[PDB]
A paper describes a structure:
During LPS biosynthesis, a membrane-associated glycosyltransferase ([name]) forms a tetra-acylated disaccharide that is further acylated to form the membrane anchor moiety of LPS. [name] is a glycosyltransferase in the Raetz (lipid A synthesis) pathway that catalyzes nucleophilic attack of the 6′-hydroxyl of lipid X (1) on the anomeric carbon of UDP-diacyl-glucosamine (UDP-DAG) (2) to form β(1–6)-tetraacyl-disaccharide 1-phosphate (lipid A disaccharide) (3). Here we present the first crystal structures of a soluble variant of [name] [name] in the apo form and bound to UDP, which reveals a novel glycosyltransferase-B (GT-B) dimer wherein the C-terminal tail of one subunit completes the fold of the other subunit. The structure reveals that [name] has a glycosyltransferase-B family fold but with a highly intertwined, C-terminally swapped dimer comprising four domains.
In order to crystallize [name], a soluble form of the enzyme was generated. We identified, and mutated to Ser, six Val and Leu residues (V66, V68, L69, L72, L75, and L76) in a nearby region of the [name] homology model. These mutations improved solubility and yield of [name], and the [name] with all six mutations (LpxB6S) showed the least aggregation on a size exclusion column. LpxB6S was used for initial crystallization screening and optimization. LpxB6S was crystallized with one molecule in the asymmetric unit. However, the biological assembly is a highly intertwined, C-terminally swapped homodimer. In vitro activity assays suggested that the ability of LpxB6S to catalyze the reaction of Triton X-100-solubilized substrates was completely abolished. However, when the substrates were solubilized with 0.9 M 3-(1-Pyridinio)-1-propanesulfonate (NDSB 201), residual lipid A disaccharide synthesis was observable for LpxB6S by thin layer chromatography (TLC), but LpxB6S activity remained below the detection limit for UDP-release assays even with the addition of NDSB 201. These results demonstrate that LpxB6S remains catalytically competent and suggest that this solubilized form of the enzyme fails to extract lipid substrates from detergent micelles. In contrast, the knockout was not obtained when the gene for LpxB6S, LpxB6S-R201A, or LpxBR201A was substituted on the plasmid. These results suggest that the hydrophobic patch (V66, V68, L69, L72, L75, and L76) is essential for productive membrane association or substrate binding.
Numbering used by the authors:
A (entry chain A), B (entry chain A): 4 to 61, 72 to 382
C-alpha cells in the first residue's frame, strides 16, 4: 500500500544537484513517490523532506546526525537508501542501514576515499549497487565483484556535443580573430602555488610567437584569485591577461588551447572541445612515499628490510590517537614483545652493518683498475 | 705513472660525511691517491682539493658549475668520478662525463629522484656502478640490469648493536625507573603540521595508563620547534614533555617506545633498538592522484577514457615552461591537429553522454522492485 519511499543523503552542492535530478527522473515514473533525508535546496524544491540540511554536512555534530539517521531510517525502512557522494559520511551509514536489511545505493565512485583494498571491500559490504560516471570506474569494481552500474557523466548530459566558440567569446569579450589561451592554475591552493608561475612563464613564451594572444584565467574563488595575483605581481606583472571570476567552462569553450593543472578539470575541457595540455607537479618526496606504499604496502624501512609488518604502521584514517595509543601500550610495557622486536632489530642491524666506507673504497678500486 | 686520481662531488653535509669516509678508506690502500672536486669541510680535511665548495650546491650558478666541472673533469680524465648523492646535480654530470669515456659511480640510491622508469634507465646510462645502502635497493636495480653494489648502511656502522639505554637517559635527564615515550612529529613542516596534534593526543591517552610517563620530543630545528610548540599550546598546553633540540638518537635509545612520523627515521630508531609505531598521514587527494599515476601512467581523465596519451601530460620536472609552450603551440595553431583532437573529444563525449539522471532513476526502481 505504501507509496515508494526513497531516502537520500547529499553532503555538498554537487550532491544536491545530483539528488534533484534523480528525484525529477523518478517522479516521471512514480509521481507519488516520497523522498526524505539530508537535502539541499534543490532537492527540497523537488519535494525532498529535509530531516537535515545538506549544509550541516558541507565532527561531533556529523556523528550525531548519522546516529539519528541510522535509527530513523531504520524505523522508516525505506525502499531504497541512496548515499549521494559524501563517502566519508555515507559509506558508514550505508553499512549501518545494510545491517538492518535496507537496500542501499552509493552514487558516485568514491575514488579519493577508496585509497586501499580494504576500503573497496567496505564499499561492497555497504552497498547493493554503486553508480559510476565513467566506464573505467565500473571496470575497476567489476574486478572486485562489486555490483556497479555505469550511468554516464551528468556533465556530459549538460554540455552540448558542439559548443559555440564564438558565443563564448562574446560573453567574455574575446575578439574572434585572435588566438586565445586558457590558463587554469588549479582549484586548490597547493596547485596554484606550484604551477601559477610556470603557467605565466609559458604564456610569456607563447606571446613571442603570438603577440596578440588573448590569455584568460578562470579563478575559482577570491582566495585563489588573490593567490594568483600575488604570484603574478612577482613573476609577470607586465603580462596582460583576463582574470575571470569563475567562468571556466566559457573560457575553455572560447579558447583555442588550454593549459590545465587538473587532470579532472580536463574532463570539462574535453567536453568544451578545447585542445589541452596538462601540466602538474607535486612534491617529489610526497610522490615517492605514496609510490612506495602503492608498490610495497609499507612506508617504513624496518618493514621493507623484514619483508613483513614487523613494526605497526597506522596510515591515513588509522593514524588516530586511540589506535596509536593501543599500538604503543604493548611496547611501553617493556615486556617480551619489546624483547622480541629488539632481537629482530639486532639481526637486521647486523644485515646492513658491513663497513660501507670500505665497501665503497673497494668498489672505486675495482672500477679504477 | 700518474697516481690514482679520484673526482668527487658532494652537495650537502651528509654527502661530505660519506666523501670523507670514502677518502680515508681509499688512502688506506693508496696513500698517494689524489682527490678533487666539490668538497665540504670534512672532505677537504682528508685532502680533497676543493675546486668548489659543497656549500655552493647545498639554479644559474649550479648550471655554470656543472658546465665548468664537465669541461675540467673532461681534461683531467680522472680514474673514477664518484657522484655522492645530490642526484639532481650528479646524474646529469655523470652522464656528461660518461660521454667522454670516464668511469662513473653514483653513491646512494636516488629513490626520490627516480620517480619513473625513464629515470631508472637514465641512472644506468649515466653510471658504471651504483652504490646502495640497502638490499632491496640493489634488488630493484637488478631487475633493470643496472650494476648496483649493496654496501650496507653507514649509520649501521656508526651505531652499536647494543646501545646503552641507561646512558642515554643520563644524558637527557630521564629517570631510569620511568616508562619513556619518544614523539618524533617529523623533520618536514608538512609532517609536523599533520601529525603533531594526533601524537600529543596519543601521549595524553597513554598518560592515563602511565601517569608518570616521560615524553621526549626531539625537534630538528627552531622552525619545526616553534611549529610544534604553537600546535601544543592549542592542543595540550598542560601536557608536560621534554622538548629537545635535536638529540633524536639519544631520545630513541633512551625510550621504551617511539611514535614516529617518518618511515625513514624508523631506520635510526631500529638501530637504537627502540620499539616503534609509525603514524603517517598525507593529503588523500595527493595520495589518490599519485596512486592513479603509478597504476595507469596518466593523471587526466581524457587519457584514461581513451586508453592512450590523447592529451599531452607534462609532469614533475617536465612541467616546465619551454616544454609546456612547445606542447601548446601546435594546438594554438587551430589547424588539423586541433580538429583531430576535437573529433576524438566528440566521440568520447558521446560515450559518456547517456542521460545519467534517468539511469540512476532506473537503478533505484530496479532495486526497489
Amino acid at each position: 500500500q505504501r507509496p515508494l519511499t526513497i531516502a537520500l543523503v547529499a553532503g555538498e552542492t554537487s550532491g544536491d544537484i545530483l539528488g534533484a535530478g534523480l528525484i525529477r527522473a523518478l517522479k516521471e515514473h512514480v509521481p507519488n513517490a516520497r523522498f526524505v533525508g539530508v537535502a539541499g535546496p534543490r532537492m527540497q524544491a523537488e519535494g525532498c523532506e529535509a530531516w537535515y540540511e545538506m549544509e550541516e554536512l558541507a565532527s561531533r555534530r556529523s556523528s550525531h546526525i548519522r546516529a539519528d539517521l541510522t535509527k530513523r531510517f531504520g524505523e522508516l525502512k525505506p525502499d531504497v537508501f541512496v548515499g549521494i557522494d559524501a563517502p566519508d559520511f555515507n559509506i558508514t551509514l550505508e553499512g549501518n542501514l545494510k545491517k538492518q536489511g535496507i537496500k542501499t545505493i552509493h552514487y558516485v565512485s568514491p575514488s579519493v576515499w577508496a585509497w586501499r583494498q580494504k576500503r573497496v571491500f567496505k564499499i561492497g559490504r555497504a552497498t547493493d549497487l554503486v553508480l559510476a560516471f565513467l566506464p573505467f570506474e565500473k571496470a575497476f569494481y567489476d574486478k572486485y565483484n562489486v555490483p556497479c552500474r555505469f550511468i554516464g557523466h551528468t556533465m556530459a548530459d549538460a554540455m552540448p556535443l558542439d559548443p559555440d566558440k564564438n558565443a563564448a567569446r562574446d560573453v567574455l569579450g574575446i575578439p574572434h580573430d585572435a588566438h586565445c589561451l586558457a590558463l587554469l592554475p588549479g582549484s586548490r591552493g597547493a596547485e596554484v602555488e606550484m604551477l601559477s608561475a610556470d603557467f605565466l612563464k609559458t604564456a610569456q613564451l607563447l606571446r613571442q610567437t603570438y603577440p596578440d594572444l588573448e590569455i584568460v584565467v578562470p579563478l575559482v574563488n577570491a582566495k585563489r584569485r588573490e593567490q594568483f595575483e600575488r604570484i603574478k605581481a612577482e613573476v609577470a606583472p607586465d603580462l596582460s591577461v583576463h582574470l575571470l571570476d569563475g567562468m571556466g567552462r566559457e573560457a575553455m569553450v572560447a579558447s583555442d588551447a588550454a593549459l590545465l593543472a587538473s587532470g579532472t578539470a580536463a574532463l570539462e575541457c574535453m567536453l568544451s572541445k578545447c585542445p589541452m595540455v596538462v601540466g602538474y607537479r607535486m612534491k617529489p618526496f610526497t610522490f615517492w612515499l605514496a609510490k612506495r606504499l602503492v608498490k610495497t604496502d609499507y612506508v617504513s624501512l624496518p618493514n621493507l628490510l623484514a619483508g613483513r609488518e614487523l613494526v605497526k604502521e597506522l596510515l591515513q584514517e588509522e593514524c588516530e590517537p586511540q589506535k596509536l595509543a593501543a599500538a604503543l601500550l604493548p611496547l611501553l610495557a617493556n615486556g617480551k614483545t619489546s624483547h622480541a622486536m629488539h632481537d629482530t632489530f639486532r639481526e637486521l642491524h647486523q644485515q646492513i652493518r658491513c663497513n660501507a666506507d670500505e665497501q665503497a673504497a673497494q668498489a672505486v678500486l675495482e672500477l679504477a683498475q
